[model samples]
Structure formats: C-alpha cells, structure tokens
Target: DRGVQMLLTTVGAFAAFSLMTIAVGTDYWLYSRGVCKTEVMTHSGLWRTCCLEGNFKGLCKQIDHFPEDADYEADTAEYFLRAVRASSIFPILSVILLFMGGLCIAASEFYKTRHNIILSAGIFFVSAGLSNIIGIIVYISANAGNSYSYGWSFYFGALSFIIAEMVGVLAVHMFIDRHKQLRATARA
Candidate 1:
C-alpha cells in the first residue's frame, strides 16, 4: 500500500511540476517579449512585409515596429497575462488535486476496487488531456509561420502527454478485467 501510494504521489508530482513549469516559463517569456501587443496591418504593403518579418524575428521586434503607432506591446502583454492566467491556473490546481487523490487511491486497498482504479485512471486521463491541449496551443503560437528548425522540447512534451494518456487507458482496461474476474469468482 505504501509503495503504491508513493508511486502515485511521484507521478502526480511529475505532472504538477511539468504543468507549472510550462505555465510560469511561458508566461515569463511572453511578458518579457511583449508578445501580447502584436498587430496585423491591412495597409502599406511594406509594413505588411516587415510586420511578417518582425513576427519571425521575435515578439519584441514585432511590438517595437508595430504599424499605425499602435502600442500593441503593452496592451498585448496585459491581455495575454490575463488570458494565460485563466488558461493555466486551474490546470495547475487540477494537477495538485489529482496528485492528492491518486495518493489516496494508492494507499488504500482500493486498488482492488474497480471504482478507485477507474477514478485514478480517469484523473490521469484528464490531466494528460489538459496538458496536451496546453502544449499544442503554446507550440502553435510560438511557431506560427516560423521557417526555422524547432527544438526537442516540444517533442518531449508531446511524447510525455501521449505516454501518460496511454498509461491511463491501459490502467483502465486492467481495472475492468479485474472487476469482471472478481464478479465471476463471486458468482462461482
């Protein structure tokens, strides 16, 4: 029981750490670069060309040379700070809850119980799904129309979430089979 509990806690901790790291790190980069104030101009072909190039260069450059005297940098920073908080805060909290709940499930003889097993697996699924969604959004936003080669961090995150989800699915199947066997034995 103790061993299982420890394992669950360890997994939960990993999830929480990943989610928080992504949120805080991304926020730091975004705010520091003033990514929120980026704008799209319909006028001036030259401005459009440069605008696209600036986006490629970096968020700071994009904000600096933004068209029409628009102070997109500050506005975008403020807006993104708010929007990102809305998207990230609850996910972090959910990871915490999943960790605690998973620990409880593991420490109990409840692994023998289908309900507990399914619940733990379900939590894992939800957490993995949330993390994957966040990863996709951030990846797209950061790489939008960029021609440069990408790094391995993105691949790592994607693979992590995929593995987590697969684990959850496998756990659920095993739980279901155990339940059916238990029921059959009881009838016998």
Candidate 2:
C-alpha cells in the first residue's frame, strides 16, 4: 500500500510540473507553421502569438483582444479567447494542489502516522486532475474548427492530463485499501 501511494504521488507530481512547464514555456499549443497558406507562420498559445517570415525571425505579441475587441454578433473569436483565458487558471491550480499533495504524502511516510495522510493527498490529486482535464476539454472545444495543427506543447498538455488522472485514481485506491486494512486489524 505504501509503495503504491509513493508511486502515485511521484507520478502525480511529475505530471503537474510538466503541465505547468508546457503551459508557461511553449508557444506551440496551436501552430500554423508551414501549414497555413499565408506567408507568415504563426504559433499561438493562451497568452500570445509569435509570427515568423520566410527567414523564421519574428516577434511575439500578446493577445490583448478578447471580449473588449469582440463583435459578439458574428465572430466567435472573443468567446474562444475568453475560454482560453479561463482555462489557464486550472493548470495553475493543479500545480499548487499536486505540489501540496506530494509534500503531504512524503511527510506522512516519514512520520509513520496511523491516520492515512494519503487520503488527503489522493483527494488533492483527484481535484488537480479533474481541473486540468476540464481546462483541456474547454480549450479544445473552444478552438474546434481552427485550421491550425496542434503542436508539441498540446500533446504534452494532453499527456499530463492523462497521467494526472491515472495517478490520482491509483492514489485513491491505495488510500482506500490502507484504511480498510487498518479497520480489519482493529476488528481483530
């Protein structure tokens, strides 16, 4: 049971870290490099877009157009932008929760407490995983018809989401089994 808890916590922490890194560091979330017929190649993320010419040198510009610059009647760009902005918060929340959970699990192991701290950690894991999943889903749905090809960062985000959830489930199972074993021993 302890082994399973450790494994799950480790994986969950890794996934959370990866998700934050990809989200913050990469502009490849939605890319049109070479895929677009336009002369300028553009790669976009939640916050900004970088455009390059034939020489592949360009400047990254912040995407400041959201509800303020949106024409609510015809274009869905405003809604998509808003959704992207909102989704960004989830990954941040996930990182915090996963970090805290991992720390708590480690402490529990060291302290050798009868009270299963893994239960709390597992709960945080589930919350983090679900938050990331929701963010990814909303972002995908918001940009459903866009012609841009997904980039490496997008795949990273998806992978992290899956990993977080799987680790969460495992952690929860470990917690449940640990509790059950404790109760059985008590009954004897």
Candidate 3:
C-alpha cells in the first residue's frame, strides 16, 4: 500500500513532467529557427541560398519570404518578439522532474507491487504509442505537399519514443505476469 502511494505519486510526477517537456519542445523549435530571441539572424537561415545580410552565397538562408516594404523590418521585429513570449520554460523543468520521478518509479519496483507498475507502464506505453502513430500520420500528410513544415521533426521523434515505450511496457508486463504466476503457485 505504501508502495502504491509512492507509485501513484511517481506517475503523477511523470505526467506533469511530460506536459512540461511538450512546452520545452515548442520553445526549442522556435529557438533553433532563430525566430524567438534576437532580431538579428543568429544562425544561417534554413530556406534561402543567401544570408539574411543579403549577400549572395551558397549557404542555407531563411527560406521563408520576407515582405519588401516598410513592414519588412517591422514584421521581422515582431516575429522575434513573439518568439520570446512563445518560448517554453516547461522543457527544462520537465527534464529535471523526469529524472527525479524516474528514480522514484524505479525504486518502487523493488517493493513488488502488482498493479502500480502494470497500470503505469500500460498507460505510458499506450499514450506514447498513440502519440507516435498520430505524429507519423501527420508528418506523412504534411510532407505529401512536398513543402517543408515544422511537423517533420515532431513526427520522427514521436516514432522513436513510441518504440521505446513499447519495449519497456512489454518487458515490465512479462516480469509482472511471471511474478504473479509464481506467487499463485506457491500458495497452492
């Protein structure tokens, strides 16, 4: 029962951390794109062959088009400003919480509870798997247009995470089922 309480708490922590990480992911994408923090192009633009400085070089430049009038500067400035606000602090906190909560979840395993691990693992696996499926579907749909979109990385990352979750859930289910069988046999 104590272990159940601990396990429940751990699961709650993990869920909270997951939410935080999603926020982090949003920020990370924006930061990487050079859209969030500075008005100056900090990195090579991804979509163009010329730098933001307008020099023609065979370098990847921000492929997204910019308006050519008075609004150009204003538009660029607005984008950076918005980036600062859209940036998510959730990711950093999530990473910290995940590490701490994961340790607790692992420790709970030693206490030999029947339901906590199964339920937690099941939920984790199913959610992860479904998320991946959704991601891949979205990615394929977006890519079908032959134009680049932000969803590409998300799709791939989701697929990878789903595989990991599936393996972990299957392994734990095997161990837990075996333990239950052994316990039942001993009682006979």
Candidate 4:
C-alpha cells in the first residue's frame, strides 16, 4: 500500500489540475447561436469572450473582462457585486487552489513526517472542487432567465471537480490507514 496509495493520489491530483487548467483557459464555458439568415454565434470563458470570425475574422475579447452584465441595478453593493463575485474570480480561484493542491501532494511524497502534508493536500483539493461548484451554480442561476447555455469547457471543469473530489477522499483514507498501521505497531 503506500506505493499504491501514493501512486493513485499523485496521478489523480495531476489529472484534475490539468483538466481544470484547460477548462479555465478555453473560451467556451458559455455559448449561444442566433436565429437563421443572420447567423451569429458567441462564447465566453472566465477570461475572454469570442465570436467565431470574418469567416475567420470574428470578434474576440482577449482581455479579462469583468462580469459583463446583470439585469438588476448596479447601485447597491449586493446587486452590483454578486455576479462579479461568481463571474471570473471564483473559478480562477479554484484553479489556483487546484494547482496548490498538486504541489502539496508532490511535496508530501519526498519525505515522511507525522504532521502529514497530505491532510493539507486533501483539504485544498476538496475546497477547489467545491469552490468551482459554487461558481458553476452562480453562473447558471445568473443566466437562468436567459437562453444561452453552458458549453464543453463548463463540463470540463465539472469533470475536473469530480476527479478532484476523488483524489481528496483517497488522500484522507490513506492518512487514516497510515495511522492505523502506526497504532498496530505500537501494540506489537
């Protein structure tokens, strides 16, 4: 076991990190297609928004645009900042935590200590997944009254979060198992 546990934990952490990174980097988290004759399409991600091309010269927003819009007024702090909180900040925050979780897992493997860095790793991994879930919900709820829907990159992040949850659970289980072994040794 230690070998098997470490192997799965390491691989799963890296896998989730890679998926989340790609999901955040792409501009297809949300999308729409307009009615015929006047064919038009649009898509957006945490960082950018795009319209396909002039055939290839499509409109694109390369800059990290803040929350594009909300139906409500922007005067009060609550109405103004709600969507903005979920817009790009949360998912990007998740990505950073996912990245940090991977590094914690990597560091844990190098040497053994009673403190258990894996515990910290597991928390980061799980938190990252949960944070993104909140962002996803916030995004969907904000657009619930509209027609545009989520795209592949949104699902990519979903899958990444699932994988992240798995890794964290596995990490926690391994931590408990190690403790059991130590207790058994002391009894012997």
Best by lDDT: 4
Tens digit of lDDT per residue, candidate 3, span 60-144?
Answer: 4342333345244555545544333233222232245344435535654665655465455445444544444443343233222
Q: Which stretches in model 4 have alpha-carbon errors above 4 Å? A: 33-39, 53-57, 62-72, 75-87, 145-147
Ranking by lDDT: 4, 2, 1, 3
Residue 128 lDDT, candidate 2, scale 0-100 = 77
Better of 3 and 4 by lDDT: 4
Clashes of 2: 0
Q: Provide the overall lDDT of each model, using Cα atoms, as 2-decimal numbers.
A: 0.45, 0.68, 0.41, 0.75
On the 0 to 100 scale, the lDDT of residue 157 in model 2 is 69
Instruction: Report residue 80 deviation for candidate 4 (angstroms).
Output: 4.4
Report each candidate's C-alpha RMSD, comma-separated, in the order given. 9.7, 4.1, 10.3, 3.8
Candidate 2 residue-wise lDDT, 1-188, digit = tens: 57756765686667666775677568778876532222467887766777756554567776553435344444566565565655577667767777777776777678666456777777777787787777777667655522668777777767766776777777777777778888899999
Clashing pairs in 4: 53-58, 54-57, 54-58
Candidate 2, run of 10 with poorest lDDT? 65-74
Task: Tell me which of candidates 2 and 4 scores higher on TM-score.
Answer: 4
Q: Which stretches of candidate 1 lie over 4 Å from their true place?
A: 1-82, 85-105, 108-114, 142-146
* Model 2 accuracy (lDDT, Cα): 0.68
Q: If scored against the real structure, what TM-score would every candidate get?
A: 0.48, 0.76, 0.38, 0.82
Ranking by TM-score: 4, 2, 1, 3
Better of 1 and 3 by lDDT: 1
**Residues 41-132, candidate 4, lDDT per residue (tens digit)?**
77767655677544533566553323344343445654435645445677788888888888888787775764388888889989999988
